[PDB]
Amino acid sequence: HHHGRIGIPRERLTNETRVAATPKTVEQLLKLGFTVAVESGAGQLASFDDKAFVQAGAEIVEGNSVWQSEIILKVNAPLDDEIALLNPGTTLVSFIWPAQNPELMQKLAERNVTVMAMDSVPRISRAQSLDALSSMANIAGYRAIVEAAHEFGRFFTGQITAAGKVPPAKVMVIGAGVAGLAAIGAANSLGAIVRAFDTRPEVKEQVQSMGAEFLELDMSDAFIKAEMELFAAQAKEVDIIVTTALIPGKPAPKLITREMVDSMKAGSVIVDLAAQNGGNCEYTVPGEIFTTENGVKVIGYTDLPGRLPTQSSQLYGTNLVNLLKLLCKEKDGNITVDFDDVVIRGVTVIRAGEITWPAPPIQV
Amino acid sequence: HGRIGIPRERLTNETRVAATPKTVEQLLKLGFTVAVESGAGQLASFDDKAFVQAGAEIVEGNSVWQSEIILKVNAPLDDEIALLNPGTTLVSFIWPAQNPELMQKLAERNVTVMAMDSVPRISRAQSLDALSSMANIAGYRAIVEAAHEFGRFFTGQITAAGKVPPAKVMVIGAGVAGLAAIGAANSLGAIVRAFDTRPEVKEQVQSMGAEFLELDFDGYAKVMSDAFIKAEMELFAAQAKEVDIIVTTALIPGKPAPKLITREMVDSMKAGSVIVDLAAQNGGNCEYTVPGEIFTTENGVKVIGYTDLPGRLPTQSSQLYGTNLVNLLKLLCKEKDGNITVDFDDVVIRGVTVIRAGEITWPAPP
Ligand SMILES: NC(=O)c1ccc[n+]([C@@H]2O[C@H](COP(=O)([O-])OP(=O)(O)OC[C@H]3O[C@@H](n4cnc5c(N)ncnc54)[C@H](O)[C@@H]3O)[C@@H](O)[C@H]2O)c1
Q1: After which residues is chain A broken (C to N over 2.5 A)?
Q2: Strands B33-37 and B3-6
Q3: Residue B325: closest C-alpha in chain A
Q4: Which residues participate in NAD(+) binding (chain B)?
Q5: Helix B314-332 vs helix B130-149: angle between axes, to the nearest 10 degrees?
Q6: Is residue A151 located within the same domain as residue A286?
Q7: Which of A74, B180, B229, B288 is the 20 to 30 Å CA partner of A277?
Q8: Which of A133, A214, A227, A247 to mutate to test the pocket of ligand 1 (most atoms within 8 A of CB)?
């Protein structure tokens, strides 16, 4: 028996580099009164070796041995042959995406387990410390710029050289949510001249506070036309475009057309952070870099957080710790679900074998 | 005529070009005409039409070699040497000391050759110093390469998912490349540390935000003694245990690079550290380095030993290098004339000129 033990399995999803705990989060989990079993090699792709987990106080296990834990933390939802190894009474925490996965939901319910979906955390301010989506979008903004710099053939950073002045790169960020603000931030660190647009005017003051230009137009379309004319104008002026625009519950809006890209200066780069939802850019090939005929690199990776695995695992694993701080107020290795707390109600999609998703309507 | 020819570089995998549209404008103001071989700027993102806009003529195949002046990045390959016609002035990297066969073959064609690697490393020549331009780019690019391979934030920050410390960066060697690396790592918010055996650079390193590392301890003899070398190795072993990124730049042309970071030191680093070895072309300052590749150690260190860092910033390298050439030419062509005077009283021209009218004139006097 393994009450109060958390099992951290190796991620089985193709090309996943992240892990749901790091040596550091493990020290934190033990402070909450749990024990931790990590499956051998779980952290290798994220640069956390077996020995560092053992040094943090975890036990390395080999088999399905990790599944004999009372609690399982993962990045991705379990596959069929994992689901069958979940014992009754187990609490599983991972990304689930219940709306897009009704059969997964039924198979978990049948194991008589509790499930909290890290995608279903309500976006209220007190829940920010558990919000994995913000965590990942933040990494992705940062990484977007790291990829852009990697692919770009000029200095990002302005500079006085004996062989001439070099101007700074000009970067347009589309969407100044969590990812777009991270991208602004990264680009600023490299000394770029940054411009941003968002439809939500309330971000104006954060964007300008970062030394970036908040772009203005000349809603509900024909607002789109003035937005597209802005992006067409900007596309001929800038070197780098980072596009991050999603609308909850929809495909990704085409904001950057083939004609906009075609007008850009050769050697320009586009990082399309909405690629997994189809991309903001018409040239985007999800999963790849596409190079246009005029010499523009369109970056469409769908795994920017997995291209920064150590940092992603750290922050995600902190998200899970912070969720467990809610569930284990006494620090005694025991989980208590409180449906009066709207945060816990949001996140809990199965409770001991009963589907509890969707949560009652909330005001975010 | 006074025509300058810019060939496409044919050394396998070369991405740089000896002129950009911007430098072609400048070439013309000096009284020259310019032909660019089609496709020459492509890999550096300058297509034919961008060269024509600038006032250059596009030509195909070997017509480019029928110019009074040839500007290249790399030395002519074997089937390019024959294409040099007598009285032509060639300007490129040559590395005479390390290629006497090349030097003989060029001499027969009865050309004048100027090796960009032979520019006297002095005050009045820094606007012409291609080795400096290329090192500066390489230092900056090293850190882009480090960031690409690194699995953590470079930049400290505070998220609701917690506080992330900055990356810690050690730069070995604070010449041109090392300082460029210090600057890019500091821009990214790292804690940057730097060692150089020359104490004069301390204030330079410090002014850019970096800690100047001191040893637990004439100058030439001090730096070669067993005692100093044991103390320097000791410093590196200790830093390797605590930093995330090491950039090594200790490289002398034609000499094999000193092994400053041993297998043992790398084996002590935190998993996911990155080493960028800018001495890889001469064997590397790190014992794990595999020149031309990234090598991953058993303990999860990425040892980056690409030898072509300026060609992984091709647009920038072509722009600056082409500007160095423009500047050589301003010095060869004082009356903005279309005509070149190889004035041997100017020490910089004396230094760069390694063949003249078929006579090997390298090496220049002290
Ligand atoms: N309370 C908090 O402390 C907090 C913190 C972070 C996020 N959140 C919440 O999470 C939710 C989503 O997070 P997000 O802000 O990263 O958004 P997001 O990821 O859905 O999209 C990124 C940005 O794209 C923008 N966008 C959409 N269409 C656009 C268009 N056509 N042109 C330009 N921009 C466009 C959005 O307005 C948004 O700012 C929001 O409800 C937010 O309030 C809350």
Answers
A1: 218
A2: parallel
A3: A163
A4: 121-123, 176, 196-198, 232, 251
A5: 170
A6: yes
A7: A74
A8: A247
